[PDB]
Amino acid sequence: GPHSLRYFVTAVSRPGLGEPRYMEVGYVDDTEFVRFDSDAENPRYEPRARWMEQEGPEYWERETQKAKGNEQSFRVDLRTLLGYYNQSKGGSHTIQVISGCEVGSDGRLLRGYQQYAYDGCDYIALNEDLKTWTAADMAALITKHKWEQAGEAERLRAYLEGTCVEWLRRYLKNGNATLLRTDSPKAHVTHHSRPEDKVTLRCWALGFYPADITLTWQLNGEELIQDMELVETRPAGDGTFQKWASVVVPLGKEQYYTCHVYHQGLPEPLTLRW
């Protein structure tokens, strides 16, 4: 199957409160496996999955040192961007980065990412050709021209096609066994009389992982694209997720409806009636 290794970088300034706050977070196939946070007590790269604890002390100190230098570099980027945009020096600002790669089953790279955001908005991104940049505005075009002169795209493409996927192959060999973890949903339906004429049939799905799931209500064969309400699936707090979906139905006519629960840890989708 396709796999990914990506890093989510945050730097946010605190005018007057000292050095800015700096974070690196690593994901393998969307699950957090390493974390560095400059506001922990002894900033260090830390394991965030217990399979990552195979890696030796040289790994951790190599990555800690790299993070410290990345951190030193984002404090300049913050001061640089204020000037490019000519903004007041009083305010808090953010830089965010998404960097990594998505690889196919042959282990070759499918998707490479190098994308920047300033104050929640796009700033510059490495295009999919892995040779050119998209700047979002005039400030970002300053960065673009300079990264063209540096051969920054070529530096990135070498990283993304090589280093990045090699490291991922090394991480999959360690936490593959863990990453395939699937928990099946546990579903049930709850009943709520609504004044005066209405019942609310709520379909719950709980204990499931991963969080990708689909819930539908059907009125004798059809799918109810309306009247149906739906919560963004939510972490329960223990590594499993939650979702519910419901709808309001007239009275004594709650035999006509059926919930269906679509999840990869189900051999067959679930069908539930009240």
Partner: peptide
């Protein structure tokens, strides 16, 4: 392993 980043 994350890349060393360059300046904006």
């Amino acid at each position: 392993s994350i890349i060393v980043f360059n300046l904006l």
